[PDB]
Amino acid sequence: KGRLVIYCSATNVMCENAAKTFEQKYDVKTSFIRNGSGSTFAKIEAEKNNPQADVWYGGTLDPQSQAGELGLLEAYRSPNIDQIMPKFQDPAKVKGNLSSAVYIGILGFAVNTERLKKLGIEKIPQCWNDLTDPKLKGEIQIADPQSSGTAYTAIATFAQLWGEDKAFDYFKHLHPNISQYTKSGITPARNAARGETTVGIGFLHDYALEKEQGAPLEMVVPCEGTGYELGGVSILKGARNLDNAKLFVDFALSKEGQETAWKKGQALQTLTNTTAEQSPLAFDLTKLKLIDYDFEKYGASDERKRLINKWVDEIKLA
Ligand SMILES: O=P(O)(O)OC[C@@H](O)[C@H]1O[C@](O)(CO)[C@@H](O)[C@@H]1O
């Protein structure tokens, strides 16, 4: 018994299902507030002297790793860690399971095929470099590196894929086609689905759900190769309900806690627990051209600040 307060950074449906399922299982009064991973980091940091939640569930790992480095988290290694894909068992900058990995999300883009026809573009873009086509001017959205974890994952991915120089050259040539840098990582999926933009860049599972729900979207794992987020779970330093936060980490890393995300929580990420059944709509990492994402390097405060700063100077303001 007792209570649990969650800062959730997954989609609302996923958060609500996790909270409800956890409360039903353990008889713990559980609540959550949802913000993206970027805006959750900012709030946890701001509240450091009097923390307002017990656990941070979901959202890109980099800001969780950064919070770990900054002393905002409380280490706890669940026994369920042994079931997690080994390379994702303790992937953050500061080791000791201040953060753990609960899912994988593939970076890519999706194309609204109905709107594409209106643009007079015959071929569905298949490569990152296809997004620099002037015919796509004002027809692409991605989240804002200044605010969004998804957008940071994108920058870090490009830097690792092509080297930093080429990554920023790409951003420079993508930039003229971006109609809006969104505050939320998921807004480009919403907008692409509804035909308000033609191409959304973000994590493919979000576009996959919109597609299965009827949106005219073609998902693209870009031809050059791509990267991914890990979704994180982390207990906050100063958690008022520490035992329940640990139980929740166990749940988050468990076979049934992960399976429920797609079975009931309408969230189609790939699961990190090797004993869990995957959604038939989840991406299979073994089939994809993926970098080896260095969370130790990119999940650090200096590097995150540096790259975001460089983006503002070189892409937004240059
Ligand atoms: O708004 P930002 O700051 O980008 O944060 C949102 C993301 O961290 C999370 O959003 C999702 O893509 C939702 O399915 C998750 O898979 C992903 O972890």
Side-chain angles (χ1 to χ4, degrees), residues 128-181:
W128 290 118
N129 283 285
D130 291 328
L131 303 188
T132 68
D133 180 355
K135 288 187 180 63
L136 287 168
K137 181 181 176 177
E139 289 298 333
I140 309 184
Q141 292 180 356
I142 191 175
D144 188 339
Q146 292 186 87
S147 66
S148 159
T150 303
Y152 181 69
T153 296
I155 284 170
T157 289
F158 295 135
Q160 296 170 91
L161 185 65
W162 294 318
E164 185 159 323
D165 282 354
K166 187 179 319 131
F168 281 88
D169 192 68
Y170 174 68
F171 309 152
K172 179 199 161 190
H173 291 263
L174 174 66
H175 181 66
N177 287 344
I178 299 296
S179 62
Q180 298 281 347
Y181 290 99

Side-chain angles (χ1 to χ4, degrees), residues 9 11 36-38 59-60 103 147-150 183-186 203 205-206 229 269:
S9 296
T11 50
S37 60
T60 63
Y103 58 71
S147 66
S148 159
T150 303
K183 298 294 193 301
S184 173
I186 69 178
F203 295 128
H205 56 267
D206 294 314
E229 56 158 348
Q269 303 98 337

Side-chain angles (χ1 to χ4, degrees), residues 164-165 167-169 171-173 175 306-318:
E164 185 159 323
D165 282 354
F168 281 88
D169 192 68
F171 309 152
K172 179 199 161 190
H173 291 263
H175 181 66
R306 184 186 73 77
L307 286 164
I308 291 171
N309 285 347
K310 187 168 171 168
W311 182 87
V312 174
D313 177 50
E314 302 203 9
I315 308 305
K316 196 236 271 242
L317 298 181

Side-chain angles (χ1 to χ4, degrees), residues 100-311:
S100 304
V102 297
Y103 58 71
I104 306 116
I106 307 302
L107 177 74
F109 62 81
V111 184
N112 183 310
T113 53
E114 295 183 357
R115 190 163 178 75
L116 190 72
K117 288 173 180 182
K118 321 258 66 182
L119 300 186
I121 299 177
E122 187 58 64
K123 270 195 52 189
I124 298 168
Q126 295 289 99
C127 304
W128 290 118
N129 283 285
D130 291 328
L131 303 188
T132 68
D133 180 355
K135 288 187 180 63
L136 287 168
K137 181 181 176 177
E139 289 298 333
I140 309 184
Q141 292 180 356
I142 191 175
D144 188 339
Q146 292 186 87
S147 66
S148 159
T150 303
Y152 181 69
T153 296
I155 284 170
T157 289
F158 295 135
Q160 296 170 91
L161 185 65
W162 294 318
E164 185 159 323
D165 282 354
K166 187 179 319 131
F168 281 88
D169 192 68
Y170 174 68
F171 309 152
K172 179 199 161 190
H173 291 263
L174 174 66
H175 181 66
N177 287 344
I178 299 296
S179 62
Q180 298 281 347
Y181 290 99
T182 65
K183 298 294 193 301
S184 173
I186 69 178
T187 292
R190 189 181 85 81
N191 288 344
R194 70 192 179 107
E196 274 301 306
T197 192
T198 302
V199 180
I201 297 164
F203 295 128
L204 291 174
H205 56 267
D206 294 314
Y207 300 85
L209 184 68
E210 293 279 7
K211 180 183 175 67
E212 294 309 326
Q213 291 177 348
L217 294 172
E218 176 80 357
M219 284 179 298
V220 182
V221 181
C223 77
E224 300 95 334
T226 194
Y228 51 95
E229 56 158 348
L230 296 173
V233 64
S234 301
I235 302 178
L236 283 67
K237 186 74 187 176
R240 187 62 73 96
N241 307 293
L242 185 56
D243 288 333
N244 288 335
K246 295 177 173 173
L247 195 56
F248 185 86
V249 170
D250 293 342
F251 173 79
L253 293 167
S254 71
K255 174 176 180 292
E256 289 177 347
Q258 293 193 5
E259 287 177 346
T260 197
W262 64 264
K263 289 180 179 188
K264 295 174 74 201
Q266 301 180 217
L268 307 176
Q269 303 98 337
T270 304
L271 306 181
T272 53
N273 184 311
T274 57
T275 71
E277 180 184 14
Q278 303 283 348
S279 164
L281 300 171
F283 288 85
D284 183 346
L285 277 48
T286 69
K287 305 234 171 90
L288 307 181
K289 294 172 58 61
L290 301 179
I291 62 164
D292 188 6
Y293 192 107
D294 189 343
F295 290 95
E296 299 174 5
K297 175 173 177 177
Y298 293 95
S301 198
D302 285 347
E303 186 71 357
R304 178 151 181 254
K305 295 197 196 88
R306 184 186 73 77
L307 286 164
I308 291 171
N309 285 347
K310 187 168 171 168
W311 182 87

